Amino acid sequence: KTYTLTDYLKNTYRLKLYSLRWISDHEYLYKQENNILVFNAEYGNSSVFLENSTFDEFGHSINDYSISPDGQFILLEYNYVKQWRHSYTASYDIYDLNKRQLITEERIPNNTQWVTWSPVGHKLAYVWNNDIYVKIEPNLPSYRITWTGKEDIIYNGITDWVYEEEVFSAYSALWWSPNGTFLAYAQFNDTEVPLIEYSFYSDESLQYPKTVRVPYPKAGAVNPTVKFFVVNTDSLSSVTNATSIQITAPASMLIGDHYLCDVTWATQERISLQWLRRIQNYSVMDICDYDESSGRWNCLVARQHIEMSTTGWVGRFRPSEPHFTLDGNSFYKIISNEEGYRHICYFQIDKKDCTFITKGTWEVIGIEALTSDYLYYISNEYKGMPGGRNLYKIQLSDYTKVTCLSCELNPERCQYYSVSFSKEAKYYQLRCSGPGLPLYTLHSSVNDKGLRVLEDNSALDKMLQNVQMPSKKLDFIILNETKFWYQMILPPHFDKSKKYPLLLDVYAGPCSQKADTVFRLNWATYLASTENIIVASFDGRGSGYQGDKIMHAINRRLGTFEVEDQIEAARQFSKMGFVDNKRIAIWGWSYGGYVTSMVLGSGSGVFKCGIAVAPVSRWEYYDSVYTERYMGLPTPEDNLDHYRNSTVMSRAENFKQVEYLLIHGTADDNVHFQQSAQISKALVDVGVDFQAMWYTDEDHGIASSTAHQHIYTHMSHFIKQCFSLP
Amino acid sequence: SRKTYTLTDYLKNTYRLKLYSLRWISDHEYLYKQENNILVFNAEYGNSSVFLENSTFDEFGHSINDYSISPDGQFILLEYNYVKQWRHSYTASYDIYDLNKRQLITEERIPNNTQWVTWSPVGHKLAYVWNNDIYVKIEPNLPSYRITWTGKEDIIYNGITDWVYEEEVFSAYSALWWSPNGTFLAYAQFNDTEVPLIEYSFYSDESLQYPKTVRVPYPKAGAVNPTVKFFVVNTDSLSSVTNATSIQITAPASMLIGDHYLCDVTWATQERISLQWLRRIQNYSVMDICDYDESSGRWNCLVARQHIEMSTTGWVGRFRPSEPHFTLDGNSFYKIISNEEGYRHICYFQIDKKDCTFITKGTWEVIGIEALTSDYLYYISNEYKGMPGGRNLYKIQLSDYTKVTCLSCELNPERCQYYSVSFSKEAKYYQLRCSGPGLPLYTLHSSVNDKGLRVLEDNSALDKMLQNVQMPSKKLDFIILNETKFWYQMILPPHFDKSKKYPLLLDVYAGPCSQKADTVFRLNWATYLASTENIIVASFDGRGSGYQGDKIMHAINRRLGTFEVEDQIEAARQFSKMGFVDNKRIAIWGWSYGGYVTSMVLGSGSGVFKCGIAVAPVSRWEYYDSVYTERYMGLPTPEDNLDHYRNSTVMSRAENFKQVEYLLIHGTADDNVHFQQSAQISKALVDVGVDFQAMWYTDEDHGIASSTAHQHIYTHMSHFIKQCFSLP
Numbered sequence A: 001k002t003y004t005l006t007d008y009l010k011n012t013y014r015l016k017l018y019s020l021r022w023i024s025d026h027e028y029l030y031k032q033e034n035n036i037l038v039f040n041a042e043y044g045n046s047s048v049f050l051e052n053s054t055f056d057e058f059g060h061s062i063n064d065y066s067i068s069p070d071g072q073f074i075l076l077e078y079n080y081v082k083q084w085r086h087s088y089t090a091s092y093d094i095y096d097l098n099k100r101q102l103i104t105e106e107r108i109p110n111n112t113q114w115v116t117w118s119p120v121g122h123k124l125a126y127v128w129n130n131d132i133y134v135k136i137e138p139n140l141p142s143y144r145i146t147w148t149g150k151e152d153i154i155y156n157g158i159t160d161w162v163y164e165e166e167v168f169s170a171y172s173a174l175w176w177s178p179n180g181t182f183l184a185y186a187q188f189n190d191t192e193v194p195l196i197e198y199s200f201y202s203d204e205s206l207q208y209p210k211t212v213r214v215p216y217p218k219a220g221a222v223n224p225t226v227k228f229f230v231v232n233t234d235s236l237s238s239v240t241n242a243t244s245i246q247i248t249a250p251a252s253m254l255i256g257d258h259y260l261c262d263v264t265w266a267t268q269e270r271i272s273l274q275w276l277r278r279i280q281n282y283s284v285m286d287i288c289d290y291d292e293s294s295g296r297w298n299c300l301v302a303r304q305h306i307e308m309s310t311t312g313w314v315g316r317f318r319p320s321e322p323h324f325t326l327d328g329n330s331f332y333k334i335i336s337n338e339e340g341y342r343h344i345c346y347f348q349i350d351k352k353d354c355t356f357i358t359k360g361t362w363e364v365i366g367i368e369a370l371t372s373d374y375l376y377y378i379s380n381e382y383k384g385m386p387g388g389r390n391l392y393k394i395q396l397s398d399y400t401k402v403t404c405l406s407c408e409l410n411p412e413r414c415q416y417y418s419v420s421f422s423k424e425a426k427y428y429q430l431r432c433s434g435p436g437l438p439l440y441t442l443h444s445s446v447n448d449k450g451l452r453v454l455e456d457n458s459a460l461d462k463m464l465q466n467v468q469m470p471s472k473k474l475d476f477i478i479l480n481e482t483k484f485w486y487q488m489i490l491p492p493h494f495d496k497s498k499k500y501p502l503l504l505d506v507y508a509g510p511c512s513q514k515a516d517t518v519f520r521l522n523w524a525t526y527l528a529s530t531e532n533i534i535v536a537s538f539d540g541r542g543s544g545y546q547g548d549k550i551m552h553a554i555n556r557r558l559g560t561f562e563v564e565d566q567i568e569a570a571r572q573f574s575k576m577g578f579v580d581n582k583r584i585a586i587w588g589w590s591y592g593g594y595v596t597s598m599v600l601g602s603g604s605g606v607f608k609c610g611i612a613v614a615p616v617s618r619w620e621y622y623d624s625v626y627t628e629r630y631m632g633l634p635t636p637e638d639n640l641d642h643y644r645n646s647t648v649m650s651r652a653e654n655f656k657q658v659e660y661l662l663i664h665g666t667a668d669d670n671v672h673f674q675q676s677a678q679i680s681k682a683l684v685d686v687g688v689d690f691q692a693m694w695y696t697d698e699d700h701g702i703a704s705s706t707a708h709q710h711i712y713t714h715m716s717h718f719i720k721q722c723f724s725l726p
Numbered sequence B: 001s002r003k004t005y006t007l008t009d010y011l012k013n014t015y016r017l018k019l020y021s022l023r024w025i026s027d028h029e030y031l032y033k034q035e036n037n038i039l040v041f042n043a044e045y046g047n048s049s050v051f052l053e054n055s056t057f058d059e060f061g062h063s064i065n066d067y068s069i070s071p072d073g074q075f076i077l078l079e080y081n082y083v084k085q086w087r088h089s090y091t092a093s094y095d096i097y098d099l100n101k102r103q104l105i106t107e108e109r110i111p112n113n114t115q116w117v118t119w120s121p122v123g124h125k126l127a128y129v130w131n132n133d134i135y136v137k138i139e140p141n142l143p144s145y146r147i148t149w150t151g152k153e154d155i156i157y158n159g160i161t162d163w164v165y166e167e168e169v170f171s172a173y174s175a176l177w178w179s180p181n182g183t184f185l186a187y188a189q190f191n192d193t194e195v196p197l198i199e200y201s202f203y204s205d206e207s208l209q210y211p212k213t214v215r216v217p218y219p220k221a222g223a224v225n226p227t228v229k230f231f232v233v234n235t236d237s238l239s240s241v242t243n244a245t246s247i248q249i250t251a252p253a254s255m256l257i258g259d260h261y262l263c264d265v266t267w268a269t270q271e272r273i274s275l276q277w278l279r280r281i282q283n284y285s286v287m288d289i290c291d292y293d294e295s296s297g298r299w300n301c302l303v304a305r306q307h308i309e310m311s312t313t314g315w316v317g318r319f320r321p322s323e324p325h326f327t328l329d330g331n332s333f334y335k336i337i338s339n340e341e342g343y344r345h346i347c348y349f350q351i352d353k354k355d356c357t358f359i360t361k362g363t364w365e366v367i368g369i370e371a372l373t374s375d376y377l378y379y380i381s382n383e384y385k386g387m388p389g390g391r392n393l394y395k396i397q398l399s400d401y402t403k404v405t406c407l408s409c410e411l412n413p414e415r416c417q418y419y420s421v422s423f424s425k426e427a428k429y430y431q432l433r434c435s436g437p438g439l440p441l442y443t444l445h446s447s448v449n450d451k452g453l454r455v456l457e458d459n460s461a462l463d464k465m466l467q468n469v470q471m472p473s474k475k476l477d478f479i480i481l482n483e484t485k486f487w488y489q490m491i492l493p494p495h496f497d498k499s500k501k502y503p504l505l506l507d508v509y510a511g512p513c514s515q516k517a518d519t520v521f522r523l524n525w526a527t528y529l530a531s532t533e534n535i536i537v538a539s540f541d542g543r544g545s546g547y548q549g550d551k552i553m554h555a556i557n558r559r560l561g562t563f564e565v566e567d568q569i570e571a572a573r574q575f576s577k578m579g580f581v582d583n584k585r586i587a588i589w590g591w592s593y594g595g596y597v598t599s600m601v602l603g604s605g606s607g608v609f610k611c612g613i614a615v616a617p618v619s620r621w622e623y624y625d626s627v628y629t630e631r632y633m634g635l636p637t638p639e640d641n642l643d644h645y646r647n648s649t650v651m652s653r654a655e656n657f658k659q660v661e662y663l664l665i666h667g668t669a670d671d672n673v674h675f676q677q678s679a680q681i682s683k684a685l686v687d688v689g690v691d692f693q694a695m696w697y698t699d700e701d702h703g704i705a706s707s708t709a710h711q712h713i714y715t716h717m718s719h720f721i722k723q724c725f726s727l728p
């Protein structure tokens, strides 16, 4: 017996997580049963913070809780209703922990788009109907900060579609000052933004299908406009209306279309803003500090920090995030150095010259902590493996004494790490995502001492001993003397003598990584375990975490090098003796579906069959912020001619050599069903047969319990059929 | 004949069938296109001149889609820039050409985007519809007259039918009715103001960045229907200052009490017109006969001249009340109505005498009246050999109803037992269109003596190229179920033998008053499946089929999805026990209603069919338009038939699709049976975890008639069949 498709679809062998919430510098909450505990990191003992019966007679079902920073109130989230990738709307009830009652007077309105606490205390701000309301106390009436909230037009406190999906990766457009004082927010105006219209069929009893309409700026279309505002909460008036001071953009940004990409608070009176231009290769860092005189926010032109690029676009997916020191006069920002590798640089608010404190043929992933004596960061520097992750601590007084805190803990089963720090970076938890079963340990920062193991997945590990689990080989091949990485989910009892069918699991998106040391139980696990299928992934040009030399290779050339490298990789995978070159499939989702489609039409005879789920077909169809970031603008004076060259429809004739399976969701707000609609029509006009499958009222995720089981049961047969498997 | 009829020969259309589509310009001559040239043939002796050459508009600069000669012959209407809309509707650009001058008319040209145009029955009076407003053009080069002034897109339809009256009622985009002399122009006005709108996406060429949303006034079962008013105008008394006064003919009080339709408009004489009205509950029609008052200029409809036609066992008519055929004086008319025995035969009526007297009778039905003279009435009926799938032309003397003489039964009973006819102006001659069972044959006859003059087209060229082909044979027979004779047909593969077991495909439609079993000769996908893949394509006509009486047609009345589904399973069970039919390989495929039956049959869990293909199927009858659905289902209300509306959905059988292999196909731009229906089908199958094959067609409507899409769907369905039947 092996890892079956039923196991994957039903979550038979479930990984164990350790979700903890640092409430202080030495205490973190943990989800035990349904009770809430409060662990003392120093001693490992806990004490019950809330029984699982406090909400026994509640009447609804909490989806997520939110204790106030001080610990005097707890916000309850129920009636969850999902919207886009990150956005959602739900209901909220405030619980007075001290009174041990439930707030009934002046309750948060239902259908609230976003809510969040202030960093300290119990001050509360939430967005409802596209407008910002702040409640100094849970029982006090809320103050209306904005009055221009308007559905599908004016977004105050929340991001619109493109900003949520392509920039902030969150529905929240609010930013609290370090302490409960100021509230910064953005205002998005989608008045002149075109609308995407697709049909929604709803439940069986919906006689006339509803037509969904979303402000969706496509490639080169009219983009939404952004305004930034800051308002003081400790001065709100119940008589007159609160005044919000608007922070404008530098002239280098106002000269044309632009975006807002980052908002980070330096000190209690200093706030950092980063602006991006339509043609996203020139960033600007405006540092604003409060003025007690005029009550305005002045941004010293003497404090800017220009960040441009020449080989490609600025930032991986956006300009990096600044990490200001405790005093707000020096920060750390991950940027790509001279040779093209992203490393931690050290800035001065007054000096426009940053000083890199790290360097090498690798990249710093993120900056996780900044104390007085040590800066903490994640990077793929260990053993020159980009697909690996470890935590290094660097001394601020010596840019040479760098210590790794995770490379050597358990190098056998731990090469991909994550960390969560306490409030004052006195302790930290380490997540070991792979290559072995996940591991959760607690550490004390004083001497980087290891305290205990919080979770080791020993319960799960006991089960896999009887099932035939697949092995995962991570290695590299050579393209034009450059070293590119790949991974192979090898079936159980792998024999290099027998010929195996190879399935190429591909994404190939800008700054992507499908080859890593991460342990995961997915559809590829069943394919190799039960069907004895070598499912592999490859990181060609465009893949990130390896320098701008590789990533920026596809700048303005989307659907070219990243497509060729995949073909080239499978070309060399087909000569390994254990790979039946006559049965090499490929499949991809989202961007991967676009590459898969661009591959099956390449006319190379390398691949026999393929599957493309929710693929892009024409870059003019996708949203602007993402598309234009890499392609430019669809104009004959910019890069229109490559927009027209990279369409998968213009490559239909060559689909006669391969079996194709096109799958898409009829409610895909992200990669509109229009994309696959144009693909099928192009194949029809050249007499190319293919398989297809639409999923009614499904989005880009196709995450419905029934839909998810259906699409993977459907693709599995297509693969078994193609490889001639029982 | 070592070669067989393949799918390429069908898709690429190798063996093409010829016709002889003429146009009677009078009682003596007709027009027929020869070799890009329009000719004029003399029915008496077969001589011919040339009415227009290929090198006449050769330099016109427009790919002419169609022409339109005038009754007299002084002008010819040219139709170019054709733009299809729905089934019968479209908008094209028009140009007039003066035959007596050989010059294109340019003064006050007919506007572009014109929705409908047509001359007067005699002369050269012209009336067209532009922006939903009627225009009258007395002379082809003089200014037009603004008849109606309420034209409004998707709201007010003047002179044209909306979507519902175009598909289910008149089967035409035209809402104009000239009087014989052309003096009066009768028209109807539709109002879809309160009608809901169906909204689906249109994707267009690659270059369209944002998908367009198509919105169409479409009344689903239960929703409010469009409202209709009727008007008449005197095309002579055209003021052009005060324009025109549109006299309105009000509907009968029996109809105005509630929702109702306008189902038929037939002119009796130069001053008498008959209007048939239909109620929401399609079982009570009322014909109104109105005369033009020469003193007040009004239109009164005497109650004595008003005729009631109702039905108790179902809906009245096959799809709508029959059209009346009035006499010369316009005081009596012969109309097709259902007998007291349940069969549809011709009845003789009088203007002011309600009790009609049938001139025909028997266990057969009259398909339709083709021509009416002062002494004989020519009609088509499935009487000969008692075959419901046959069509022959009959001639009955109006002074003696025993003088029943068939004109086509005996011409060639071998290759012809299904006839279509086209008479002259006064029926001096008539063309016979034998569609089957042999190769189509076109002939011309003279009614004065009823003798064959000359053969128009015997498709001898087609017969010459089928020599080197292994054609399938077609058998027409019947089985018996509960003392009733139900008919079926099979397309047997060439060299048929009972010593083998054949895969059998059940081609189905099974709609109300339908008939998939007949004698017609066809070259289609079924011919390829039988000729090449050796598949027995069979069809069955039982319970709900027309032309067999009301007791069979009105059986599924207010009960769709039970009798049609049950008989197809019963017939398939019958055919599976004949001997030469294999049990392991039996399928079923249907288009439109046939797709609804195909899905219902597979969802029945009867366990008979290995696979099944449904193309543009109906899901629930709440999704389809009102007039068609409510004609067979009543209203979807608790006090009517809502309970059956819900127990007849195909989604409620998603659980039973685990046994059968399913293939769902539907066009994205389908405005008749919306893609919404198939979307709900797949969603139901997904919610119960049953795998199936699916295929959408971008921008394709309910026809899937595109050149590239037609070949693609049948190529995909051929693979689905060949793999389900394990055929090499």
Ligand SMILES: N[C@@H](CC(=O)N1CCNC(=O)C1)Cc1cc(F)c(F)cc1F
Residues within 6 Å of the ligand: A085, A165, A169, A507, A589, A590, A592
């Ligand atoms: N960009 C996403 C990649 C993705 O969607 N995949 C990759 C693998 N195959 C798929 O089909 C789906 C991941 C991602 C999205 C965010 F919004 C974000 F904030 C952070 C993230 F890491």
Ligand SMILES: N[C@@H](CC(=O)N1CCNC(=O)C1)Cc1cc(F)c(F)cc1F
Residues within 6 Å of the ligand: A165, A166, A167, A168, A169, A317, A509, A590, A591, A615, A616, A626, A670, A671, A700
């Ligand atoms: N829009 C993209 C957002 C993204 O990639 N990231 C990277 C991780 N960090 C982020 O902030 C967000 C994802 C995406 C790309 C496609 F090409 C596509 F077809 C569909 C998609 F969903």
Ligand SMILES: N[C@@H](CC(=O)N1CCNC(=O)C1)Cc1cc(F)c(F)cc1F
Residues within 6 Å of the ligand: B171, B509, B591, B592
């Ligand atoms: N109702 C239509 C049913 C049909 O023939 N089918 C359905 C499936 N696809 C086909 O090609 C065959 C035919 C039809 C006949 C008339 F006489 C008429 F006036 C209007 C019509 F629409």
Ligand SMILES: N[C@@H](CC(=O)N1CCNC(=O)C1)Cc1cc(F)c(F)cc1F
Residues within 6 Å of the ligand: B167, B168, B169, B170, B171, B319, B511, B592, B593, B617, B618, B624, B628, B672, B673, B702
């Ligand atoms: N709407 C129907 C019109 C019709 O059948 N006729 C019969 C021949 N004479 C006429 O006047 C029109 C056709 C139809 C029925 C369905 F159930 C369906 F799903 C789709 C369809 F197109």
